[PDB]
């Protein structure tokens, strides 16, 4: 029946990578690369004290399932002779002699994984002979649940029952040696596939066709315009309800969110197919939802979407979690069963999560997730600010070191997240009042002595963007922007001098009403539905056929040429918008001293003044007494022309509006954007490649390389409705009228910049990528990802750049 064995320890462990040369230290390599190092590593493992019990166990299961599980009902097993020669020289040989004794009185047949058909009569001891010589075990890496190298030992030639079988495979698809690597994986990384993934009769060319690819290019050039319009309408239809809110009743940012949720669904589903229900129920997982739903009911529905987003992320370790989700979610009929199963596996969930410092931070959240059956994700997030902050700052820092060309943006976001109030965005409040103190108030987040000088965030963004592009006007930025209570409220100082809650003391309500007014004006006036109606796209050719010419591992397109027109009609931009931005500017009547500080109380200006006071005026020379007899009346004229009653808002309006602020109708237009601009994507002999996601996957997409994109706004009109000024009462009116000159120079600068920042015959090149998807979530480009040749590792280091299996050697 049984056999003779001693060592059944079975347990083992994995290994670690090497790193080498100038490659980044993040080791995430894959197959190939280490061609002949694998045999050496396997020999080193074989030279460990743990090798013999693992191989003895392997023999045990081999003779268990292969020999006498298809037997032992009518053949007792005996193992008289059995020996290995696992030597320190890494050479092992085996000799085995087995007896099959049939107690039953019948004649049967012996089943083996070979053409084995032997007849044994009743009460006979059938003989089994196995011999193998000391030889170097061959090493083949199979795949693991996390998709790693399952190195297994193969026999080159062994005599079974006296006949020699070659390249013998031992226990395929199941081996107990458990040695793996955390940095070397299975498959062809991103590039080794592109020698045989495409070609004469390969997957892509067979699964790509001319009509389909041109339909794809049309689809890509349409859906971008579509999603642009959808984003435009959505952000703003939300603002429609945002603005018309009456003060005193707070609104969550997610309150109106459900009010127009169908537009969100359409947006996100036209982005990625079917990915609308996922957000549809994501956006209702708070106590504020009219139809609240459980996060378990949420997660249960569309597993495919969670899988897609998880493998869209760039963190490699997450792949390991992807191993269990199917094992987690097999045979589940409703969310209650999910709660039950998660509670059952919580014993296995706690240690691995609780053993990593990164997740040692996360430790609390998962607990109450597994305890209470009514967790709602937004309430969950507001329950624990700190851990979310600690993780998010690390992710933000990684992003900041990733892309430095937006150094100030990656800057500004960071200083938003220092204060713990920001995450209250996922908490009940008044969104406008909350966002104001998030961006319209000085910050003092430090405790050395006092850091109120850090000021607000938008002003930091300003002085970052306009670092040195201006010199003189920065004084006005200090005067009316950098020291504006509407823009910089100077917290903790408001309740220091008033102590009576005056109407002016509460700057908060004034800035809030101005913000609401601007939002409502941009929303219901500018971003109105009728305005977005007056934009369209028109097809031009859609007639030529693109053929595919190929030579071995190449796929070209003979003549790319697609061009669509976009008609703007009357992209009307009402007045009152920059009126609202002026309302942002301070309304104080004090302008005389500020104009002096700009025009006169400068640094170099006083330099020329002192130069001319002490000397100068060639030819005259000695007429110095009346030098302070001329530089008083001209300034007197520049100061008397301005009206004390008027403000800097009026001064800016004069050069922007023309006609006075008192006679401005918001119904009229300021900016006129009309006409039609074309896009002429084209080319010849462009290669088609497979395009990928971030992590291991079955399904794939594709792309066309290096398209010569040309976009031209020739024959477009971009004008001002009020080109000619109308100001009856300009700020600097009189014989020394400069307001109309400011208007004229503004018009000329606008014309020049529209000749530059607007239509300039833009030329660009990129790689148009499309992941073509069928109707029933069955995109045409995919692989079985079950054979050890269809695995593509997007994050594996380029082996052609240099890696060696040794510590810096």
């Amino acid at each position: 029946q049984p056999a003779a064995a001693t060592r059944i320890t079975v347990e083992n462990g994995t290994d670690k990578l090497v790193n080498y040369k100038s490659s980044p230290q993040q080791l995430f390599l894959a197959k190939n690369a280490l061609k002949d190092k694998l045999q050496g590593e396997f020999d080193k493992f074989l030279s460990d004290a743990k090798a013999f019990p693992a191989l003895t166990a392997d023999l045990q299961e081999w003779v268990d399932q292969q020999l006498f599980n298809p037997n032992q009902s009518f053949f007792d097993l005996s193992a008289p002779r059995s020996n290995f020669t696992l030597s320190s020289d890494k050479k092992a040989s085996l000799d085995f002699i087995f007896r099959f004794t049939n107690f039953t009185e019948s004649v049967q047949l012996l089943k083996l994984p070979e053409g084995v058909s032997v007849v044994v009569d009743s009460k006979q001891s059938f003989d089994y002979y196995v011999n193998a010589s000391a030889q170097k075990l061959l090493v083949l890496p199979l795949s693991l649940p996390d998709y790693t190298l399952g190195l297994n030992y193969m026999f080159d030639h062994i005599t079974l029952n006296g006949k020699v079988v070659n390249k013998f495979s031992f226990n395929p698809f199941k081996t107990n040696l458990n040695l793996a690597f955390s940095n070397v994986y299975n498959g062809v990384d991103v590039f080794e596939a592109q020698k045989n993934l495409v070609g004469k009769g390969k997957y892509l060319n067979t699964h790509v066709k001319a009509e389909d690819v041109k339909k794809d290019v049309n689809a890509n050039i349409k859906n971008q315009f579509d999603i642009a319009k959808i984003i435009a309408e959505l952000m703003g239809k939300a603002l429609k309800e945002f603005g018309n809110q009456q003060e005193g009743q707070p609104l969550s940012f997610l309150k109106v969110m459900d009010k127009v949720k169908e537009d969100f669904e359409k947006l996100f589903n036209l982005v990625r197919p079917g990915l609308g229900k996922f957000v549809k129920d994501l956006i209702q997982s708070s106590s504020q939802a009219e139809n609240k739903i459980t996060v378990y009911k949420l997660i249960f529905d569309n597993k495919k979407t969670i899988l897609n987003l998880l493998k869209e992320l760039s963190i490699p370790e997450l792949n390991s979690s992807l191993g269990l989700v199917d094992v987690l979610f097999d045979g589940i009929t409703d969310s209650d069963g999910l709660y039950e199963r998660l509670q059952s596996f919580k014993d296995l969930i706690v240690p691995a999560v609780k053993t990593n410092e990164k997740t040692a931070a996360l430790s609390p959240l998962i607990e109450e997730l597994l305890t209470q059956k009514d967790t709602y994700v937004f309430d969950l997030i507001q329950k624990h600010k700190g851990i979310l902050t600690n993780l998010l700052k690390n992710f933000l820092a990684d992003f900041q070191k990733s892309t430095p060309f937006m150094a100030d943006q990656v800057a500004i976001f960071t200083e938003l997240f220092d204060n713990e109030g920001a995450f209250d965005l996922f908490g009940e409040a008044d969104f406008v009042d909350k966002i104001a103190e998030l961006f319209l108030t000085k910050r003092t987040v430090k405790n050395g002595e006092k850091i109120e000088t850090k000021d607000s965030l938008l002003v930091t963004s300003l002085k970052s963007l306009l670092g040195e592009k201006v010199a003189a006007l920065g004084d006005l930025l200090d005067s009316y922007i950098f020291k504006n209570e509407l823009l910089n409220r100077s917290v903790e100082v408001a309740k220091a001098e008033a102590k009576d809650t005056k109407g002016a003391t509460d700057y908060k309500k004034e800035q809030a009403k101005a913000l609401k007014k601007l939002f409502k004006h941009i929303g219901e006036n500018t971003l109105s539905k009728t305005n977005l109606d007056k934009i369209t796209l028109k097809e031009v050719k859609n007639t030529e056929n693109v053929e595919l010419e190929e030579t071995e591992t190449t796929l070209k397109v003979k003549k790319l040429d697609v061009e669509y027109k976009v008609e703007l009609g009357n992209f009307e931009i009402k007045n009152g918008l920059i009126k609202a931005m002026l309302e942002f500017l301070p309304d104080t009547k004090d302008l005389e001293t500020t104009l002096d500080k700009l025009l006169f109380k400068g640094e170099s200006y006083k330099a020329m003044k002192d130069k001319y006071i002490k000397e100068g005026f060639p030819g005259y020379g000695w007429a110095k007494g009346v030098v302070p007899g001329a530089f008083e009346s001209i300034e007197n004229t520049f100061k008397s022309a301005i009206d004390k009653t008027k403000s800097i808002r009026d001064l800016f309006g004069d050069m922007l509006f023309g006609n006075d602020l008192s006679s401005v109708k918001e119904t009229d237009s300021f900016i006129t954007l009309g006409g039609s601009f074309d896009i002429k994507y084209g080319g010849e002999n462009l290669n088609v490649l497979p395009a990928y996601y971030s992590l291991i996957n079955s399904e794939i997409g594709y792309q066309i390389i290096g398209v010569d994109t040309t976009i031209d706004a020739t024959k477009v009109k971009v004008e001002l409705k009020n080109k000619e000024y109308k100001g009856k009462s300009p700020a600097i009116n009189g014989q020394v009228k400069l307001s109309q000159s400011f208007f004229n120079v503004w018009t000329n600068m606008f014309d020049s910049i529209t000749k530059q920042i607007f239509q300039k015959k833009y030329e660009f090149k990129d790689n148009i990528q499309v992941f073509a998807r069928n109707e029933d979530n069955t995109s045409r480009l995919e692989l079985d990802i079950s054979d050890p040749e269809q695995r593509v590792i997007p994050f594996a280091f380029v082996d052609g750049f240099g890696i060696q299996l040794k510590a810096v050697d």
Partner: antibody
Framework: QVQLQQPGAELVKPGASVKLSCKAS????????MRWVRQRPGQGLEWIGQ????????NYDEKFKDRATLTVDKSSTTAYLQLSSLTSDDSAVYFC?????????WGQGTSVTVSS | DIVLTQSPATLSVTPGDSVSLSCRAS??????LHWYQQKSHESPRLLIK???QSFSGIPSRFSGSGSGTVFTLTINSVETEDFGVYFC??????????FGSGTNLQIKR
């Protein structure tokens, strides 16, 4: 809201097995860890083990693994301590507890005397 | 194993005092700590969770702070039935949940 208790002032002879109980109620007995903890009067606290909710897996102290046995009655929501009279000086007090992750409830305790 | 060290061993104060208890570890445990109250001859009362989370029923006068290994419990107002021994208790791993050497709150009046 959790009441997990039953006995008090246990008396056991040397050489005879002893059974301590703690009967819980007022929550889902299927969603937390039961715990046994020991304290000598006037000194620190020592652990015994955990076995619940239905996985029937247990974790003991190595200093107490041969010493004590834990059992759970699922229908009546009760846990048990069975260490017998293996030692004599252990005539001290015990406690049976519930998961701290919700919050660390406790029982009023069980004082045991190993004598006749 | 993780050993929690408390200081001082004894704490004698007057009613209403703002006092603190210091518990330090050998290596960081993130927020895997707890503060329990035990008065003489009965079961403990857990006071503060996670070094940052209070718990219901406990009066608001208690508070906690936590960073790395240096964790602090704060009693804004000392009152008579707060007197007793107190234990800090880690939850990084559960080979047991080491408690401290003990700190017995006491009065001086």
């Amino acid at each position: 809201q959790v009441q997990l208790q039953q006995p008090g002032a246990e008396l056991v002879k040397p050489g005879a097995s002893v059974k301590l109980s703690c009967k819980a109620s007022g929550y889902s007995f299927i969603t937390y860890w039961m715990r046994w903890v020991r304290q000598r009067p006037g000194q620190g606290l020592e652990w015994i083990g955990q076995i619940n909710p239905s996985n029937g897996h247990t974790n003991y102290d190595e200093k107490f693994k041969d010493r004590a046995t834990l059992t759970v009655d699922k229908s009546s929501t009760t846990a048990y301590l069975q260490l017998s009279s293996l030692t004599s000086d252990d005539s001290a007090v015990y406690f049976c507890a519930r998961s701290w992750e919700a919050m660390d409830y406790w029982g009023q305790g069980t004082s045991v005397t190993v004598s006749s | 194993d993780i050993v929690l060290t408390q200081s001082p061993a004894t704490l004698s104060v007057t009613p209403g005092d703002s006092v603190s208890l210091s518990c330090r570890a050998s290596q960081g445990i993130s927020n895997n700590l707890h503060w329990y109250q035990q008065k003489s001859h009965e079961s403990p009362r857990l006071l503060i969770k996670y070094a940052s989370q209070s718990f219901s029923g406990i009066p608001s006068r208690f508070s906690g702070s936590g960073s790395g290994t240096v964790f602090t419990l704060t009693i804004n107002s000392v009152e008579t039935e707060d007197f007793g021994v107190y234990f800090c208790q880690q939850s990084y791993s559960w080979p047991i949940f080491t408690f401290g050497s003990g700190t017995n709150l006491q009065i001086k009046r």
